[PDB]
Design an enzyme around this catalytic site. Structure first.
Site, short mmCIF file in Angstrom:
data_model
loop_
_atom_site.label_atom_id
_atom_site.label_comp_id
_atom_site.label_asym_id
_atom_site.label_seq_id
_atom_site.Cartn_x
_atom_site.Cartn_y
_atom_site.Cartn_z
N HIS A 104 17.12 50.99 26.68
CA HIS A 104 17.76 52.23 26.27
C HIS A 104 16.74 53.18 25.67
O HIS A 104 15.68 52.77 25.18
CB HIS A 104 18.87 51.95 25.25
N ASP A 140 25.51 48.21 25.04
CA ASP A 140 24.58 48.66 24.01
C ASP A 140 24.84 47.98 22.66
O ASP A 140 24.78 48.63 21.62
CB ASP A 140 24.61 50.18 23.85
N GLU A 434 53.31 46.16 42.22
CA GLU A 434 53.77 45.38 43.36
C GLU A 434 52.91 45.55 44.60
O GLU A 434 53.11 44.83 45.58
CB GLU A 434 55.22 45.75 43.70
N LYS A 532 58.35 27.64 32.97
CA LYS A 532 56.94 27.32 32.86
C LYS A 532 56.07 28.56 32.98
O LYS A 532 54.98 28.63 32.40
CB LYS A 532 56.54 26.29 33.93
N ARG A 619 47.99 38.94 35.60
CA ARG A 619 46.97 39.59 34.78
C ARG A 619 46.49 40.89 35.41
O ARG A 619 46.39 41.02 36.63
CB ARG A 619 45.78 38.66 34.57
#
Lengths: 656, 110
Positions: A104, A140, A434, A532, A619
């Site tokens: 950087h 960073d 979807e 489940k 997810r």
């Protein structure tokens, strides 16, 4: 030391030169394609690689799984990032056993983010340098291995400071590369207390506010000097650019904004007086300050506006094509109450927006998108942003009448989109979660994940494909006609206002509503498919704050992008049932409600119902909105979401 | 002395600097219109002229009669041209009493 380099610009060229001087066996370099329109004042990494014979590539998106596989087959030892304009994630950084080191151009942790040089020149700093640091998920935020400091003279300009930064980088790399090669790595922790992260800068910031101090304005001019776009000033309705100026004595007997002399040109400020030495007007050549003043025509006494008055931004107009719904009546809350914003709405009712009907800057019109096409067409030409939040998401309409998921979902939205390319407007189209269908990719990425649907004989996939082809038409329109757009995908936005529909009609968009129904009429907790499966929800406030600044385009950062507004965290399989009794500890009634018994259906065998339900809650990547743009991390919690939805739902029912 | 210099590319800036060190009173510089982009491998004489404060002019079309009369009233005594891509005809050649010199970089006439 087989190393992988992501290089660009003069820093990248010098990094490659230093790495080859030290003796690193560079496997390959990743660079960027040539900028369409810019100034070629910097060396080319690709040309350097070609001369040195090291293979070079310029991937569009290096985070694609294919490129990760290629890098892994390249057997990395250490990764070096020398001024790479894109972002590299842990997918690549974990393939280097020695790690990844980024170079950087700032004294970290001061001045994080992008363009450290221009930013430190804007604030007028006098001591910066280059820094090599480790690479973690937070950009960073790695330990400083080495850090050189150089001083800035007041006569230094952008190109001179660029050269000094390059030379300091060379000197730093000469005394650091052997240390990394032999395994000697020093770790100096970054102090988060003294961390300032400056984001990307755009020419819009180059406006010269005349009420600002003359010295500050001088730093502004020298920050973006040649070969950068330059300062930005306006005389009447004519743009002119200041390429070189200097500060004059603060002592004056004139009012702020009055030009005191044109030969040489000298403008006044709040304190001090900027003297334009070298300037350029519009699209031409740089003349003398006196010549520039003569060409512009301003004389002693004329005042220049610091910014062209666009009628105070004229209250950017938002046309929401469904408001009484769930997302519409919350976005309307967000941009009506807070901020100025003028909003036009069109739905088939005003049940949920009855608190805005008498608001000064909310224009509601009842109607349907099929009969009021004239109203919409007129209001796409008058407004500025368009949000078509019309939904046909009900599965009943998928299965019974798939000829209505096309003539109203596809055909009407396609008409609305073609109103935005005809009048050159901006459309924020709501895509769906979807579109991925039965994709199995852990995280449903916006640009890497594939979309899987069932065969044609299944009529329930016509909504996924209708809304998937609408995203491929907006994308096509935004490349051949330059349509300005943004595609957001809300996964599980839930909150108080979702729906009632007399107990969700038959169960359309059931989610949590049926559970709240169970908590009133003494009903057991049914466990469909055994319970489940885990589900991840999103607070409506989080999505609205993420969708608020999609409309509030900051520096036009993500235009023509796709953003998944969801919570990859906040998973709930059994914890979904966990905070039912304990979360309800602030109940004021403390009467009746008959706490339901914890029904248990552990029977796994559900072959009579049939496999193929597919977990609706999967997810999200949340990566194109978390840091890249919109800077949006879902903060809230899992607690207040339920603790408020349940309370509001209970309050809305009169019951006794 | 009073000189008019048509300048472009790097050698234009070099000649301007050399004459300024020498002590030539440069009346005006005529400069080519900047192309959007071909290659930014050279400096611009306009930048140097602006920094030194000596006036520089960039006519869009040098063949306009008004610019000819302006050049006439400026009364140049010696004109130094360094790669000027515009067209100069005999109409201009008789308004320069001492003439002008053009710099060509190959074995003439080949």
């Amino acid at each position: 030391m087989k190393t992988v380099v992501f290089a660009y610009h003069d820093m990248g060229c010098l990094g490659i030169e230093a790495l080859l001087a030290a003796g690193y066996e560079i496997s390959a370099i990743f660079t960027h394609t040539d900028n369409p329109g810019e100034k070629a004042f910097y060396g080319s990494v690709a040309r350097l690689a070609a001369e040195r014979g090291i293979p070079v590539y310029a991937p569009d998106n290096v985070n694609h799984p294919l490129w990760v596989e290629r890098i892994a087959q390249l057997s990395p030892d250490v990764i070096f990032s020398f001024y790479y304009r894109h972002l590299i994630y842990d997918e690549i950084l974990q393939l280097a056993p020695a790690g990844a080191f980024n170079l950087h151009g700032s004294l970290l942790p001061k001045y994080r983010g992008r363009a450290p040089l221009n930013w430190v020149l804007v604030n007028g700093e006098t001591e910066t340098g280059v820094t090599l640091h480790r690479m973690v998920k937070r950009a960073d935020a790695g330990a400083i291995v080495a850090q050189l400091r150089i001083a800035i003279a007041p006569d230094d300009i952008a190109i001179t400071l660029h050269h000094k930064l390059c030379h300091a980088a060379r000197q730093l790399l000469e005394q650091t590369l052997p240390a990394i090669k032999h395994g000697n790595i020093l770790e100096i922790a970054q102090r988060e207390n003294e961390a300032t992260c400056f984001g990307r800068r755009t020419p819009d910031d180059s406006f010269l506010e005349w009420h600002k101090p003359a010295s500050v304005l001088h730093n502004m001019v020298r920050a973006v000097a040649d070969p950068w776009p330059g300062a930005f000033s306006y005389v009447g309705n004519q743009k002119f650019t200041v390429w070189s100026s200097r500060v004059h004595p603060h002592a004056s007997k004139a009012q702020p904004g009055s030009v005191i002399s044109v030969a040489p040109l000298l403008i006044a400020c709040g304190d001090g007086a900027l003297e334009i030495v070298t300037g350029q007007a519009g699209d031409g050549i740089t003349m003398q300050g006196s010549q520039l003043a003569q060409t512009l025509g301003l004389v002693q006494g004329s005042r220049l506006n610091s910014q062209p008055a666009c009628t105070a931004r004229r209250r950017t107009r938002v046309l929401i094509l469904g408001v009484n719904g769930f997302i519409g009546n919350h976005l309307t809350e967000r941009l009506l109450r807070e901020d100025h914003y003028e909003v036009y709405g069109l739905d088939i009712g005003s049940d949920a927006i009855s608190r805005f009907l008498n608001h000064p800057h909310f224009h509601f019109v009842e109607g349907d998108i099929s009969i009021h096409s004239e109203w919409i067409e007129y209001h796409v030409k008058k407004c500025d942003v368009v949000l078509p939040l019309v939904a046909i998401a009900t599965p009943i309409e998928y299965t019974r009448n798939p000829l209505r998921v096309f003539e109203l979902d596809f055909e009407e939205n396609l008409r609305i989109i073609r109103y935005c390319v005809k009048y050159r407007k901006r459309i924020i189209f709501p895509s769906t979660s979807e579109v991925y269908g039965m994709c199995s990719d852990k995280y449903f990425d916006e640009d890497h994940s594939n979309l899987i649907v069932g065969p044609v004989n299944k009529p329930r996939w016509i909504y996924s494909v209708s809304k998937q082809l609408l995203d491929r038409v907006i994308w096509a329109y935004g490349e051949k006609e330059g349509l300005q757009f943004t595609l957001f995908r809300p996964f599980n936005w839930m909150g108080p206002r979702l729906d009632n529909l007399n107990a969700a009609r038959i169960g359309s968009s059931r989610a949590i509503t049926q559970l709240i129904l169970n908590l009133v009429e003494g009903s057991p907790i049914k466990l469909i498919d055994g319970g489940k499966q885990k589900r991840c929800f999103t607070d409506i406030r989080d999505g609205i704050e993420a969708l608020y600044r999609i409309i509030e385009n900051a520096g036009n950062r993500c235009d023509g992008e796709i953003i998944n507004i969801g919570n990859p965290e906040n998973e709930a399989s059994i914890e979904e049932l966990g905070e039912m009794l304990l979360a309800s500890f602030e109940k004021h009634p403390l009467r009746h409600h008959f706490p339901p018994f914890a029904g248990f259906r552990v029977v796994e065998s559900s072959s009579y119902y049939g496999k193929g339900y597919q977990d609706v809650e999967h997810r999200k990547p949340s990566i194109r909105n978390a840091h890249r743009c919109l800077d949006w991390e879902p903060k809230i919690d899992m607690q207040e979401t339920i603790d408020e939805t349940l309370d509001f739902f209970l309050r809305t029912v009169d019951l006794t």
